[PDB]
């Protein structure tokens, strides 16, 4: 009767699990979150889509009637922390290769960035210490923003030239593209130090002398490795097109802006109405108000533009859109140099890059020579309105979590100072493409969502979790 | 026996069997103090919960150890891992015992003297003893042959005032009844097929859901063969049960077969004996859940639709592409005729026991027990997309919102294998010395348990209806699992006895388990009990009134180990659980392992339960009045558990020893015989139970709260350090400092409070049974009531009928616009908080949402009161007079009529379910609630007995 | 707590 | 010299008795084989248990026999690939195999 | 027949 049989036979011996067996989990973990349920609720906050009339999965997100106990990101918080960040901790204990350590430190620093953009605040200094501290302190967002850029710097300065020896499904061991992914996150985290006016001299200094370099990535920074079978698809399509039925219809701010500009990206992810064959977005949080004004039979799903799921089954999860990357440059060219001609061809390259990804290559002329021509852009702020509002389009169906983030920092697109009910009662008032505060709005202060709730799993077991606050209160870098 | 020092009940086979349940425990429901017995559902084959003195294990293992002769008997349970989308329960280890083979059962309720069975006895013991060979007249053949019927016990109470529609307006395709008040006018309904539409008068049909159900039916046959001599005995039995339940078709099916052969032979000082049993079952379950399951699909019918008018699939409007509604539900007849959820089990268990008496006082006993099972699950669903999507309204016409997305078919199969060995080597010594009596018993126990399974699944069926692993063009999924646990122990039990008046018992035991850390495997636990038959020293007359008077007291401990593999770290094949799906490796061609999310420990110490108990037992006048009372105070301490941890620590849970979970209680039995002539007798029985659950501490380092079962962003049931186990938290309406419900200024609907509130616990406040047995000559009449009151339980059945507009509650205010009575508006700019009388109504248009969310209670409304009074069983039995059995081969004949689960009466707040339901199994997490579990049933049957 | 449910259709 | 001596222990136990109306037989057998091929890869473990009985009462006799058998085999696989014996036969006559 | 068969190495 041997009693020494308590090593679990269902899992490998801990020696045999090496750094190359753990590392691919880090990106897939991060992707399953930020390309899944985070990406999801960010698409509502950025106002790309809206709850379908005849179903009800996401009423609470459209109308901002959710609270901390709704657990609107408790899955993703478990995934990014107990999944990606712990595995990244283990890779960093199991390999000495500076290249692999660089590539994990970026992936790790990306996760903290995403959690900070959600709760402005994240455990960091003391996270991932297990039973030596079950109750991590929650760092202010910029001890960790300055922390993880301090990491990416240090792991970059450790590169000795040797290659990567762990399976890399983002870049395929191409350390050149990790160079550009790290600088690209430097570009986006530097800009927010600026537009939050924290050491705004030093970080404009650095955004000048990192666009200096063009030492960025090529292509898109993604995880494209999905098959349309089971447990292998895009997380967002998986959740919303096999686990649920269709709950997403196109929202009024996006659909009108793209009709306004005669955009042909209008059709990529968005269907004509099943009733009249036109493009109709639903005003934010206006699901229930529209069937009250129009009637039940007259605001079904056939009267609003559905979100086409068919292009998403295998579709990649993006962490950094190329079209976004050059939109960020185009804004530092127009603001911190003043190099109009250079800005113009960063902008034009963000649009051309997007047009190609949606299968409309060769038709960027329809935006680059028309309403959104850089010719008609009078003011400096008129150009940036063009930069930002074509950024906002570029991230639709690509990276919703950033699209909402950058909406808060530049605060363009802006809150149409008109209520949903007015815009309903006469459309001519609404400037196409600016945001409508939800018709039904559960935020006592009114306005647009600025901050996800804190994880209830953190609320319950971690006493040092900041006290819940309404969605109305900005993340540290949103100052306007 | 009955020199015992703690609470114990004994039931005879005749009582066990008289109810004619297929199961051995369910006829005892509500009939024994401290022994809570529920059935998970009236679905044929389902499991049974038996819980002694409340929940002590938070990790879901609270059933008593079953011990058949006395070899511990496997009690595993087979039930759905996912109660929310595919709930089903295929049975419980003990459901295998043939009721007709039971001679006596004796429930040990105390956890203070368990050295004879070790740890698993802290939850109680059900000691069963089987019939042996007996010399009787004439041949030794007993035949039992029964027939039984099922009928629905209680359907939710429906409004019949508003028909098909939404927002208050008529539609032609709703899954609900928020339409207008019935006209008797003619109004189209259903999808349109061949440019034709159905058209019928717009009026209620209040029996549409009731007509849906058939009458359950079940037949049974058991035979036994019996004989003995002065040296040996032999018993062989066979039982058989076939049930097809209340639900239309074969979908609700249970078939049981047992065969047993027990025997002994004595020769000189040595006796050898053996018991070998085979058990076969075949279950079919009509799965529950929130998807396309029968019942969910069935309750989402408008009150004006004729549900039985949907069975004929030769009417095209009932085929899946034209079924009258598209909203996440299907024709219930299609589901039950075309889905597959089936289980088969073969099982062998047996004992070998050898006794050797030597040197006047000693006895050597070797006992070996084996219990091995192989069970096989097979589940299929059709590829609805390939069959029905193109060209149909439901259909291509609904796009991404069709019920057929992405219902592309699925089939899986699992074979599981269990095997338990138990070995007992004991020597017993018994000598009277003067008036004293001494009995000592030292023994060795060894035990080994093993389960394994292998699982395979294919999705996207090429041929849309054939359920085979060949029928997919996509990747298969394969899973495999094994666990192995071992334990040896030494024990000793000294019982002393003076003049048949004082009894004293001392037990000691020390175990070594394989599931504890290597440097801390051994745990020790003693006990002590005392009995004092103080009747034996009363007056000569005063002891003519008191037939019997015993007082008893026990103090003792019971150690316990952990579940398998909770010490070392683990790396899992990396997988990410996202809402309503996964993203798992391999991708794409690469495999990956991830640090597992439950941090393990080598710090763990053994579990230890300490219990004190006093009891009193007295009988009066011929045993014409009798009572037993007991008081217990039990503390399960340091139980090993995966305690929720903040994932930012890098793990979602850590394995540690908890604090104390205490259950204190009163157990009261009271019987009396008002009338006992020689031809007539009337007996009355009243048993009463009150348990007080309190978690005393969960390690505060990790908070003092861990979820037991919960919905993400919804009602969850916890264990919290100051409270009983099973505290629910649910959303409640915000209220201002004077108690009025704050309401949105524009909608009229309640506003959520910032936190969930506490809203009750799972525990009954008390439980009691009242029963009476009439005997006149050879007629008997038994009647037993079961009373459980207190505590709360989640019920999707109420949740869906509120959301549907079918519940009677939703016809409130005759669905005219309304202001929530005593509502206010919160008026707050920045920092100044003020409340104003609410003026906003809730529109006709929005009344559906008000009720869909739960009225002013919000989601806490779907915690229902778990209380009921139930006519548990009635049995009318007639032994035929032996004089009419003389020209017959028959030695005896008894015909019997019985009814079970006959009526249920519940508080007014609950017009929806029989509270005796679940979708999460027969243990702790079962108490969370039912998730549109199938409606419980009313049973009634005959039985014919014949002795030869 | 873990598990997740969907709303209905209407 | 590559081969070992196989070794095998066995243990059988039976119990019987009768009366003039009944009989009872119960038996146990165990067999543990580890064959001549080096290591535990030749392995056969057999366990059987059986219990049979009869009882006559008048003109009626009922008897039953119920038997359980357990077995665990380990085979040293044969054939043309990287099998043991194929690997063993393809050895030069000067090569020491036990080295 | 059926079933292949490989030459050896040398
Ligand atoms: C008078 C006979 C007393 C025999 C007493 C044997 C005692 C050892 C049990 C033991 O150490 O641990 C039991 C754990 C599981 O046992 C097995 O897996 C079974 C192993 C094989 C046992 C075979 C027993 C054959 C008995 C006829
Ligand atoms: Ca049936
Ligand atoms: Ca060998
Ligand atoms: Na993990």
mmCIF file of C-alpha atoms in Angstrom, chain B residues 160-163 170 179-187 200-204 304:
data_model
loop_
_atom_site.group_PDB
_atom_site.id
_atom_site.type_symbol
_atom_site.label_atom_id
_atom_site.label_comp_id
_atom_site.label_asym_id
_atom_site.label_seq_id
_atom_site.Cartn_x
_atom_site.Cartn_y
_atom_site.Cartn_z
ATOM 1 C CA UNK B 160 -54.264 34.169 -18.397
ATOM 2 C CA UNK B 161 -55.077 37.831 -19.010
ATOM 3 C CA UNK B 162 -52.565 38.876 -21.708
ATOM 4 C CA UNK B 163 -51.535 36.921 -24.792
ATOM 5 C CA UNK B 170 -49.587 42.274 -30.375
ATOM 6 C CA UNK B 179 -49.540 41.436 -25.516
ATOM 7 C CA UNK B 180 -53.009 42.948 -25.100
ATOM 8 C CA UNK B 181 -55.929 41.716 -23.035
ATOM 9 C CA UNK B 182 -57.670 38.814 -24.777
ATOM 10 C CA UNK B 183 -60.464 39.879 -27.149
ATOM 11 C CA UNK B 184 -61.693 36.599 -28.540
ATOM 12 C CA UNK B 185 -60.928 38.338 -31.859
ATOM 13 C CA UNK B 186 -59.024 36.526 -34.608
ATOM 14 C CA UNK B 187 -55.353 37.496 -34.969
ATOM 15 C CA UNK B 200 -57.023 31.572 -34.557
ATOM 16 C CA UNK B 201 -59.118 33.354 -31.906
ATOM 17 C CA UNK B 202 -57.078 35.386 -29.427
ATOM 18 C CA UNK B 203 -58.014 33.768 -26.117
ATOM 19 C CA UNK B 204 -56.203 32.032 -23.263
ATOM 20 C CA UNK B 304 -52.655 31.715 -26.008
#
